Amino acid sequence: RKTRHDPLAKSKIERVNMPPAVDPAEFFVLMERYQHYRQTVRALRMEFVSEVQRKVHE
């Protein structure tokens, strides 16, 4: 929304990008879940791409 060259309301420069705390077991479980879900999504995308290629060939 800010086009670089703007008066930029100096109201957000007084904050620290602090990352909230995290648990160990829950974080590892979620990491494995994300990895497997991304693997499945990439597999589905590859299947859709193969189907599109077959359609284009036909």
Place this chain on the structure above:
Amino acid sequence: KAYRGGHLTIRLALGGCTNRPFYRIVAAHNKCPRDGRFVEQLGSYDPLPNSHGEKLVALNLDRIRHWIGCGAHLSKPMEKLLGLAGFFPLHPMMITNAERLRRKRAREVLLASQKT
């Protein structure tokens, strides 16, 4: 309009009045406006329920899958809807929310037991 690599991104789009939230999944660009130009329109979304609930949602896979394979990306609410429908696997964020809700229910049960 020439966008900075405006790739196709199936995003949501409002379509209701004040005090009347209504949405509609649409296959638009990643930078185009919400209710702006779009290519194809998919099955609208019904958020508010009614008589015995009518949360209706539809999708035209024949063209949705084609546009996806054509190099289009998906947004977070798009993945949420896909997981709720069953096309894609259940979103992990939904599972985390369910686990947090279960933990909150356990805490509420503990508080209720402490009431006595």
Place this chain on the structure above:
Amino acid sequence: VRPRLIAELARRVRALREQLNRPRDSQLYAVDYETLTRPFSGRRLPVRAWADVRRESRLLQLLGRLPLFGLGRLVTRKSWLWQHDEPCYWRLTRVRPDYTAQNLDHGKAWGILTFKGKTESEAREIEHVMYHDWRLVPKHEEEAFTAFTASVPYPPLLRAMIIAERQKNGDTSTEEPMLNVQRIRMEPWDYPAKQEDKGRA
């Protein structure tokens, strides 16, 4: 016809300037050890990059302590040692030091990058070289230390859909095959690649 020549002239001038007189990393990628700020912008840095600049140093300023910028030396990463216990380290094959700076730093250096002891062929471009998580492993106990420690069934919805399609076609086929995840890799958070997508100023 009246073509837009002034716009093209301005574009060419700006491109030539930004490509020739580009500010070296020593000017824009510098880090203030008193407040962790980067000149040429005046902004702070994430919180997870505090101790890295305090109790650790960058990459090229460590290479400087090696003979000839370490023509064949190694170097590990603190983040990998914290996340994984496998021998994950870097090496040097072609260094690109910046000459416009005392005690050279912020430069670019790469080599044969390995992941969990999985070396590769032909050194790849840099990957997060302006960081501070760098730990050295001298020659003593070097080679002796560097030692190494398909498919899936379809989901229920797609499985049922395929079975229904088969039934509609005619053939029954009660077999539940498995999809392919060959080229699909479970790229971790630190998937090594290149700085092309994450281009610098």
Place this chain on the structure above:
Amino acid sequence: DSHKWEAREKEHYCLADLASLMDKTFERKLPVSSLTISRLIDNISSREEIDHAEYYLYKFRHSPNCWYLRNWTIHTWIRQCLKYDAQDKALYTLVNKVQYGIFPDNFTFNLLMDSFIKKENYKDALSVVFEVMMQEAFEVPSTQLLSLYVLFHCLAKKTDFSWEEERNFGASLLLPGLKQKNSVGFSSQLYGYALLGKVELQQGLRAVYHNMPLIWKPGYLDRALQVMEKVAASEALDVLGAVLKALTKLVEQLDIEETEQSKLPQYLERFKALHSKLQALGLTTQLVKEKLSTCEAEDIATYEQNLQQWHLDLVQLIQREQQQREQA
């Protein structure tokens, strides 16, 4: 020593003009070669001129040619320093380290240690020891002389020194600790390992391998115990270490992993048993001198071959520079 080196076949002695030309080439804001500076250093015969050349090389380090650092050039420079003068030059460049990082490790270091032991040097030899422990060497038979000097300076100045000084001493005692002669080498290795383990445990884990080239392994007392048990199957330092141990957040390890601080009785018993075993089976400067008497047969043929090869390489570099000037 430098006696077996007087054989350079130098050329003209144009110093000031060529130095000004090199300064101008550096001012050109373009990469420049250091072959002219190498030729000068080989032909220079003064002290202020060598200082000016060193300053010019330092300023050139911040030039487009951050590389282009031939080792034979620094070898000839060190030989000139040994022969003529130029005392506080190589020492300063190596103390800076980051400003130069020459690290000319080779049999040249062996001859340097030999010459220093012949004249009984002090500050220059100590700087060379700091350099060799900061760099990576021990591929030459100079390890005997290095251990001799280390034991000399460790037994003649038995003091607590300081944090960084103790770390440097422990490193210089352990880094070359790869002897394989007899019980003396194993005893020296055990002494170095015990010193490193003490410096790692008594002090801390973060202020040890920070700057010096060492691994983050803290458990060194167990390693020394195992090494001495092995040498027995085939000193007062550990006594004082155990006594201090019995005397009365950033975590770079696993939470379940218990720190080695809570190991007073185990360490005491193990050290006592293994020391009794050693005494049953089983100062060092004389032993290292006797070792040197056996080895170090003045094997100067290989060094003469290496010097001839380096001279041929310098001549080839001069010819390449001539061909380059002809092409351009």
